[PDB]
Design a protein around this ligand. Structure first.
Ligand SMILES: *C(=[N-])c1nc(N2CCOCC2)nc(N(Cc2cnccn2)C2CCCC2)n1
Length: 217
């Protein structure tokens, strides 16, 4: 694994999105991972529809704005045989009837990989695959009102995750304090342009390696 990685610079990552007042972070984490994998497959970066996932992936166990999981989203795309573009199926921030139309499918997957629950394994995955879906303990106001710098919350749990986000890289700063570069779905005004630097190799801080996965294509 290289000492740092940033898949934004290689064209794998769409702009930061905003889930609004809906428990759909899992859909944004899953679309971000599949956007990366489709880009590596095809060389085309196409924003994918979280609304398609929120409306349609109930059979796989998702609950719309009442939560869900990225692996359930990857399973839906496999079962469905496709996923629409964000342009064809824009985000509404409420669960509505399923409107998937295969004519506008721009992505597919063949299942998913669950990464071993270790930050070394996560680093190898990020370096060899692309952006990776992860779950973190985001349930402290220090995270809600994060602005900049390496996020380190002594009270964070490595087992009690409550938010899904996307690891787009890792690196270190000199101020060797290491971090994961994490894309959130709270809009560009949160954090650093919508990103957070999460402490890396600090005893699986906030559980970032505990439920990491990505779709196969
Ligand atoms: C992301 N917006 C989000 N939202 C929720 N909820 C809780 C259910 O009501 C809606 C808001 N949950 C999650 N979860 C799933 C979760 C949360 N806490 C306990 C167990 N699962 C995250 C999705 C990836 C793993 C955690 N996210």
């Amino acid at each position: 694994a290289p000492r740092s990685v940033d898949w934004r610079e290689k064209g794998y990552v769409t702009p930061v999105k905003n889930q609004g007042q809906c428990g759909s972070c899992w859909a944004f984490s899953a679309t971000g991972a599949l956007e990366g994998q489709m880009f590596r497959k095809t060389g085309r970066l196409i924003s994918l529809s979280e609304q398609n996932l929120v409306d349609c992936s109930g059979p796989q166990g998702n609950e719309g704005c009442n939560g869900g999981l990225m692996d359930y989203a990857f399973q839906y795309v496999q079962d469905n045989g496709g996923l629409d573009s964000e342009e064809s199926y824009p985000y509404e921030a409420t669960e509505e009837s399923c409107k998937y139309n295969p004519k506008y499918s721009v992505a597919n997957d063949t299942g998913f990989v669950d990464i071993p629950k270790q930050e070394k394994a996560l680093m190898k995955a990020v370096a060899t695959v692309g952006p990776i879906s992860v779950a973190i303990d985001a349930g402290h106001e220090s995270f809600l009102f994060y602005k900049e710098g390496i996020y380190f919350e002594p009270d964070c749990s490595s087992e009690d995750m409550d938010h899904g986000v996307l690891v787009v890289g890792y690196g270190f700063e000199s101020t060797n304090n290491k971090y994961w570069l994490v894309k959130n779905s709270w809009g560009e005004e949160w954090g650093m342009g919508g990103y957070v630097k999460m402490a890396k190799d600090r005893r699986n801080h906030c559980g970032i390696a505990s439920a990491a996965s990505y779709p196969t294509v």
